[PDB]
Design a protein around this nucleic acid. Structure first.
Ligand SMILES: [K+]
Ligand SMILES: [K+]
Ligand SMILES: [K+]
Ligand SMILES: [Mg+2]
Ligand SMILES: [Mg+2]
Ligand SMILES: [Mg+2]
Ligand SMILES: [Mg+2]
Ligand SMILES: [Mg+2]
Ligand SMILES: [Mg+2]
Ligand SMILES: [Mg+2]
Length: 114
RNA sequence: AAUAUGAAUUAAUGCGAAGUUGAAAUACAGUUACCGUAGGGGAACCUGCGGUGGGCUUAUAAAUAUCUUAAAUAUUCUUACA
């Protein structure tokens, strides 16, 4: 059915987020999912959102909150810069270690009631 | 006692022409107007108290914005590729 397809659509895959797109507090990790469009689609203002992104946007990365609003605009910011922070961390090749010597969370360890 | 008539006597008002004394109202009408009420004054009107808008909704910024392969690759593409 159409409902089944919609639930699995790429737009459905992005978790609902209404966090401020302009946040001036302390940032410790990414808050919005970066959206990327290919160069061919960018030439046609196609991002896979509800409406065409304004042609003024030359970046290929954005973050958004609402597909449409009462102001008849998309709420988005044309930035994708948290990906470069992650890739620069990867280039520094420093593994993240636990200062408390806890078990690795990414391994299925056999824990006990200690 | 009622009804009708006339009535000394006396009250209110309309229209007509037509000047006079002011300039109260319509614009922020030159003191916002009007409602109720009270007092005062040649005349409109003036003043006090509250009410109404049938006057002020007539309302319109203390400005400041961001990084990924610009192309041998996107931009071309005509039912083709798959
Ligand atoms: K007056
Ligand atoms: K009055
Ligand atoms: K009065
Ligand atoms: Mg006067
Ligand atoms: Mg006058
Ligand atoms: Mg006046
Ligand atoms: Mg007086
Ligand atoms: Mg008054
Ligand atoms: Mg008036
Ligand atoms: Mg008015």
């Amino acid at each position: 059915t159409l409902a089944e397809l919609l639930g699995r659509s790429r737009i459905a895959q992005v978790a609902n987020n209404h966090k401020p797109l302009t946040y001036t507090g302390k940032k410790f990790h990414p808050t919005h999912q970066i959206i990327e469009t290919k160069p061919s689609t960018l030439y046609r203002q196609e991002w896979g959102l509800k409406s065409a992104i304004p042609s003024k946007i030359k970046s290929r990365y954005l973050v958004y909150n609402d597909l449409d609003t009462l102001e008849r605009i998309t709420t988005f910011e044309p930035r994708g810069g948290t990906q470069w922070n992650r890739l620069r961390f990867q280039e520094m090749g420093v593994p993240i270690v636990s200062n408390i010597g806890r078990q690795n969370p990414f391994f299925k360890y056999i824990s006990r009631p200690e």
